[PDB]
Amino acid sequence: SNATTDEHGLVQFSINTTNVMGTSLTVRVNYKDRSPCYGYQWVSEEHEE
């Protein structure tokens, strides 16, 4: 599920509880990866998730 950053760059949300046990939650944003110039290059914009 996508959403947009409200004032002061922020987003609150909730999710449905019906699975196994350990629940992994990651959040990606503007530029989900670094496809152009990768593997071969030596310097890049390593932005955190």
Binding site: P36, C37, Y40, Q41, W42
Partner: protein, 49 residues
């Protein structure tokens, strides 16, 4: 020391406003869709005698 001339027949030179350069660089792994892969430059100007 570096020099540049211009002739054609019987060594008759021709006069002109030369604009020589000497750009130089390191490795070539930043061009994989990455601008400014070619490192810093150097340039000169003058007239031919």
């Amino acid at each position: 020391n570096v020099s540049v001339c211009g002739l054609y027949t019987y060594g008759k030179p021709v006069p002109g406003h030369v604009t020589v350069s000497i750009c130089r660089k390191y490795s070539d792994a930043s061009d994989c869709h990455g601008e400014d892969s070619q490192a810093f430059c150097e340039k000169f100007s003058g007239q031919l005698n």
